[PDB]
Design a binder for this molecule. Structure first.
Ligand SMILES: [Zn+2]
Ligand SMILES: [Zn+2]
Ligand SMILES: [Zn+2]
Lengths: 385, 235, 652
């Protein structure tokens, strides 16, 4: 019965085209198993200066293995990567690390952009018991009251790491729809390997996007989907003003070494508990402390540092696309317009405008690293006007 | 060994339920056989340690012999699912809690079988009814005494989906399946779905099945059998 | 006599196994393992079929081909070493009579289809179908119905031989009762089942059943219908784990009649699945404990995960005599007696309540412990119909003459270390054969004296003690359990004198030994304990996290390796994927201990675990080392000069 039936599963899958060329097409189906969802982007409108809120379910669902030795191990490790790749892409923003554990919510790291503080917090978050049940109501309470004091010229989005369990919290979180719909705060959850309808209704009543974790690769995809600053609901803001352009200071300008250290509890700046020698300078406090392209606590305006953060999204929107042809128009001497090679896996990648020939390793290098076709350069800037 | 002949049978209906409770979210309406059966069902459940995680995962909606208190949990179940709670309802197939609902993907999307859903109660209402159909077709003892259970089974069980994407986890905890469940299930429903290669599915193994089921089935929905114009297809 | 199924085949046909010249059937493989790997995949790789000995596993680019067959090809293999994503060797044995849902030619096809027509030597061929699949159902009419098979072409030899040896031949309250008998169907196809020849002839028959070329599979139809009584089983909330959930699923993938023998690793759910088989099966069962050591244990988790206890408890060794009158479920011990009135009425009860046991179940822990002389009394005394072999050992006692499937039938399941130690509750041991530079004033004497006081010399070493003193405080800092196993008492006694710890010896009072277990296994203040030869063997299963050993002299590799395999449990709820169980051994350099450890670490890499030799400490004078002055060691040395041979012998 089943001793045969356990091996009726194996026997055919083992078997293939016999005689010659055996265990060959089994490898071909594995390549045919590949090539999942690429981009499907092309959007406009919103996404600028997010104010994210990490919300972590700490529950007994973590004790199931399912991808890793812990579901936090699946979670927490790639959050650091998600932190770094965020600060890579979006430095104009800041993130609220808030942890739910034992039916409450602990705002673990404040809404800020200092990566080491966030990452070591995750390195502190390693040895978490995740005792108790999730409570989103305490999480939204922090999320309200913090972002309540943020301007309406702020992007208001929440990223919830939920372990798909029972949403164990009172006090009419169904009525928190109209609370937060009016409060123009977006809330995005993704479910860990299952679905919560109420939370699925929550996000579809939000405009925040809900998903379910499939796999570790798939876990990365939706992170990567939420790296990009999304086009949230209309009528948020237009502008955001008193973007402080700073100065770097060399502390060697006119008076050479007239100050042994530029942090002595009286100097304009010197914000954090450490010694400094003068590296930076804000306009409004005239605040000189450790360099930070974010904001301050006395002038209270945004320490904008343009080549970093006014450059990051500044080309992250205006992209175009390529096309693929299997044909052989042999442009070059059977070459690439970029790296100049050939393999011909029938993916001759042609630009939409300048129409230049590329490979996967030239398409990926654009569509992950270069983000534009340089074949448009020499082609845009020469007749540009 | 009947609903009160041994509880060793009953030692693992909790186990096959709690793990169903642990995996499956979003409200479940299961079907017992009768009220004293239901009274027998929860009889070991209090005194022996059963609910110790069952109330901790979802909550439970007892349906009463009296229809007054039976309508109460109902007021709860439509509410206690649509808030932060799964709240699995517990009910009886042959009892009149099983009509008039049409459960939606909103609340109620899974059903667990519990036993052969036959009569087992009224004495000797059978025999004259039996012998008259034996005066009509003469081999019917074996025959409809299967289907009477079956005609009530998917009457109860096949309810929780309305449109056609609404989900349904209609598992079959049953000892009598060999022909009877197969004869009683719809010919559209035995064919593509029932026992494709999954018959003697131990719950611990069948855990990952619904896991594999839902997780895939929750995502990627846009297009599902889209008809526009008339293109023959001819079934 | 009459105990000869097909022994393991390869014995000849090979000369200087470097077959650089011949490799003739491997040349058939080496054609297509080499002609096939051209375009980035191998489509080849015959598992490196070797005619004699065994063959290998590719397992380095398995992808789907050999990673599916990382398990499935291993049916008749056993995968005796384990590795990283590389090759993996095995052995070969009796394990086709277990693999009886498949034909020996069907595997032979896929044995070729894996090997890309890497052709057999034929050695396996002349050993493929030596025993055709054949079962022995025990159907409702009180003994057996003479089942043959799904397949017919076997009675054609049989019925032309066997009968000419020995013949064979209210309403709704009862409506469902025949609906159960309605379910008594064709036994998957045709059955071809005959009638019992009077219950006293099968013993006369079984010896001739195998005599042609067939072999028989004794079953146990004890679940749907059973004519004698059923005890009260009750599984009181005994949540268990998928290592052993698979196990009974291998014992029951068919209907309600098939016996079973399953291998676990050490410390696994041993007293669980048999207790699970005690209750689910609805029998009246039997345990055969190794000693009373086992007997107290196996009832205790039975007292835990079964509420079947209302003097319903039958333990039967060393004047236990607990519930003779009325047997429901029993624990016994292997009556190895053969003596002239050994236990007059008591072993008579063991004889006569075996008869009341009828068949029950043969719960048999670790039958590598059982000699073949006692394997006589396995079948001679106990004549049951279903067995249970709980034996971590696959191959024992170097006895390739007598195999074991003739004893217990098929050997059903073995559980992977990898899917317990990396994915599962079983902790990761760090094995440590630690050798030390001694003081030379133990060794000039050693080489001067060719007399067993020389054994005690390296034994009583402060260089050993400096290692011994070290890891105590080094693992006091992690606040986790540690246990040290010495060789003999009076050297170990001074360890329990110098850095005085919990300790035992041979004649120690057990009630205070139990207090020591209470002081150890319950009290978190002192995670340190000493044991002797007896405590591993005759009193306790220790339950700890870190093990240190001193004794390494006798060549019982596994017997020592199963001590550590039982004791070492999970250290903490460690988030990391590291090794958390810990083994330590103390090795004398330039010694028998140096020599034995070489073969011992050979046996360590024979099964293959996380192993490291360290020699130096993590800073020796970091700790306030006692015996830092060798004059103090000379004070110890003159005790050793005053010592006799009596401190230098074990329990045997
Ligand atoms: Zn200012
Ligand atoms: Zn290119
Ligand atoms: Zn271009």
């Amino acid at each position: 019965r089943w001793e045969g039936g356990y091996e009726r599963t194996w026997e055919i899958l083992k078997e293939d085209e016999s005689g010659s060329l055996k265990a060959t097409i089994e490898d071909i189906l594995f390549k045919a198993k590949r090539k999942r969802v690429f981009e499907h982007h092309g959007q406009v409108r919103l996404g600028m200066m997010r104010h994210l809120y990490v919300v972590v379910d700490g529950s007994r669902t973590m004790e199931d293995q399912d991808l890793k030795p812990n579901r936090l191990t699946c979670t927490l490790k790639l959050l650091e990567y998600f932190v770094e790749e965020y600060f890579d892409q979006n430095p104009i923003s800041q993130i609220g690390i808030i942890v739910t554990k034992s039916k409450r919510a602990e705002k673990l790291t404040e809404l800020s952009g200092n990566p080491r503080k966030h990452i070591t917090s995750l390195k502190k978050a390693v040895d978490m018991t995740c005792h108790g049940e999730p409570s989103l109501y305490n999480s939204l309470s922090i999320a309200m009251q913090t972002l309540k004091h943020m301007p309406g010229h702020t992007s208001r989005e929440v990223l919830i790491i939920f372990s798909s369990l029972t949403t164990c919290d009172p006090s009419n979180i169904y009525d928190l729809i109209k609370t937060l719909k009016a409060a123009k705060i977006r809330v995005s959850v993704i479910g860990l390997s299952a679905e919560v309808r109420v939370c699925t209704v929550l996000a579809r009543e939000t405009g925040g996007t809900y998903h379910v974790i499939l796999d570790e690769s798939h876990y990365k995809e939706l992170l990567t989907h939420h790296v990009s600053p999304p086009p949230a609901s209309s009528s948020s803001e237009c502008s955001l003003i008193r973007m402080g352009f700073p100065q770097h200071t060399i502390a060697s300008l006119s008076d050479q070494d007239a100050k042994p250290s530029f942090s002595m509890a009286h100097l304009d700046g010197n914000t954090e508990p450490g010694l400094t020698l003068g590296g930076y300078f804000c306009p409004q406090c005239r605040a000189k402390y450790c360099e930070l392209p974010v904001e301050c606590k006395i002038c209270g305006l945004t320490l904008v540092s343009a080549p970093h953060l006014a450059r990051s999204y500044h080309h992250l929107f205006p992209l175009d696309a390529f096309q693929e042809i299997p044909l052989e128009e042999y442009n070059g001497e059977r070459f690439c317009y970029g790296c100049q090679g050939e393999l011909k896996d029938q993916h001759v990648y042609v630009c939409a405008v300048c129409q230049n020939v590329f490979c996967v390793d030239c398409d990926v290098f654009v569509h992950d690293s270069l983000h534009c076709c340089p074949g448009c350069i020499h082609k845009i800037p020469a007749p540009s006007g | 060994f009947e609903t009160r002949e041994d509880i060793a049978v009953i030692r693992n209906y909790g186990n096959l339920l709690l793990e169903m409770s642990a995996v499956v979210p979003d409200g479940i309406v299961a079907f017992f056989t009768s009220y004293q059966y239901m009274e027998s069902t929860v009889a070991s459940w209090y005194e022996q340690g059963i609910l110790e995680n069952i109330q901790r995962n979802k909550l439970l909606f007892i349906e009463t012999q009296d229809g007054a208190e039976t309508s109460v949990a109902l007021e709860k179940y439509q509410e206690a699912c649509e808030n932060g709670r799964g709240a699995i309802l517990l009910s009886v197939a042959r009892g009149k809690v099983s009509e008039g609902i049409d459960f939606v993907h909103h609340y109620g999307r899974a059903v667990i079988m519990f036993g052969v859903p036959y009569v087992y109660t009224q004495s000797r209402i059978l025999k004259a009814r039996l012998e008259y159909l034996r005066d009509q077709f003469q081999i019917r003892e074996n025959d409809f005494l299967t289907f009477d259970a079956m005609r009530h089974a998917a009457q109860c069980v096949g309810r929780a989906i309305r449109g056609k994407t609404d989900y349904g986890l209609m598992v079959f905890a049953d000892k009598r399946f060999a022909r009877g469940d197969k004869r009683g299930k719809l010919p559209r429903w035995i064919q593509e779905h029932l026992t494709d290669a999954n018959l003697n599915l131990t719950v611990d193994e069948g855990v990952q099945v619904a896991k594999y089921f839902l997780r895939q089935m929750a995502q990627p929905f846009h297009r599902e059998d889209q008809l526009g114009l008339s293109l023959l297809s001819l079934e | 006599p009459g105990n000869d199924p097909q022994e393991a085949v390869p014995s000849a046909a090979g000369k200087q196994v470097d077959e650089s010249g011949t490799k003739v059937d491997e040349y058939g493989a080496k054609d297509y393992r080499l002609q096939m790997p051209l375009k980035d995949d191998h489509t080849s790789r015959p598992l490196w079929v070797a005619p004699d000995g065994h063959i290998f596993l590719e397992a380095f680019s398995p992808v789907y081909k050999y990673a599916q067959d990382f398990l499935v090809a291993i049916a008749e293999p056993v995968c005796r070493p384990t590795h990283v994503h590389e090759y993996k060797l095995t052995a070969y044995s009796l394990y086709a009579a277990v693999s009886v849902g498949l034909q020996t030619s069907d595997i032979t096809e896929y044995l070729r289809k894996l090997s890309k027509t890497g052709v057999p030597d034929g050695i396996m061929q002349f050993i493929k179908l030596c025993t055709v699949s054949y079962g022995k159902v025990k159907l409702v009419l009180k003994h057996n119905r003479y089942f043959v098979e799904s397949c017919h072409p076997d009675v054609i030899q049989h019925l032309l031989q066997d009968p000419v040896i020995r013949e064979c031949r209210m309403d709704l309250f009862d409506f469902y009762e025949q609906m159960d008998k309605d379910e008594e169907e064709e036994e998957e196809t045709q059955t071809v089942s005959f009638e019992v020849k009077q219950e006293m002839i099968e013993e006369l028959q079984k010896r001739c059943i195998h005599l042609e070329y067939p072999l028989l599979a004794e079953y146990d139809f004890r679940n749907d219908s059973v004519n004698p009584d059923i005890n009260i089983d009750l599984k009181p909330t005994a949540v268990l784990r998928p290592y052993q959930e698979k196990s009974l699923r291998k014992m029951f993938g068919n209907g309600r009649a098939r016996s079973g023998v399953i291998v676990l690793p050490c410390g696994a759910g041993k007293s669980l699945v048999g207790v699970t088989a005690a209750c689910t099966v609805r029998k009246r069962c039997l345990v055969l404990g190794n000693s009373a050591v086992s007997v107290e244990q196996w009832k205790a988790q039975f007292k835990m995960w079964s509420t079947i206890d209302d003097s319903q408890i039958c333990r039967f060794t060393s004047d236990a005599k607990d519930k003779p009158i009325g047997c429901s479920v029993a624990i016994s011990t292997y009556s190895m007696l053969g003596h002239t009135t050994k236990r007059s009425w008591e072993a008579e009860r063991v004889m006569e309540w075996l008869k009341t046991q009828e068949w029950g179940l043969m719960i048999l822990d670790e039958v590598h412990t059982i000699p073949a002389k006692m394997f006589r009394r396995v079948l001679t005394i106990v004549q049951a119909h279903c067995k249970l072999g709980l034996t971590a050992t696959l191959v024992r006692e170097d006895d390739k003459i007598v195999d074991l499937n003739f004893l217990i039938g098929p050997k059903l399941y073995e559980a992977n270390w990898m899917e317990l130690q990396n994915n599962g509750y079983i902790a990761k041991v760090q094995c440590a054969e630690v050798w030390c530079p001694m003081s030379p004033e133990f060794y000039r004497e050693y080489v001067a004296i060719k007399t067993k006081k020389r054994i005690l010399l390296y034994t009583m070493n402060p260089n050993k003690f400096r290692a011994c003193q070290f890891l105590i405080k080094f693992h006091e800092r992690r606040n986790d359990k540690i246990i040290v196993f010495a060789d003999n008492v009076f050297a170990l006694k001074e360890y329990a004198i110098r850095l005085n710890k919990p300790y035992i010896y041979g004649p120690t009072s057990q009630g205070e030994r139990m207090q020591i277990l209470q002081n150890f296994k319950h009290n978190p203040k002192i995670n340190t304990i000493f044991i002797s030869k007896v405590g591993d063997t005759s009193f306790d299963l220790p339950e700890a996290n870190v093990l240190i050993q001193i004794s390494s002299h006798g060549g019982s590799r596994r017997q020592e390796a199963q001590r550590l395999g039982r004791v070492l449990r999970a250290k903490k709820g460690m988030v990391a994927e590291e090794y958390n169980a810990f083994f330590y051994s103390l090795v004398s350099q330039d010694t028998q201990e140096m020599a034995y450890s070489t073969k011992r670490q050979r046996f360590l890499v024979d099964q293959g675990y996380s192993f490291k030799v360290i020699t130096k400490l993590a800073g020796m004078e970091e700790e306030d080392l006692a015996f830092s002055t060798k004059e103090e060691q000379q004070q110890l040395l003159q005790k050793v000069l005053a010592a006799t041979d009596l401190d230098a012998e074990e329990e045997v």
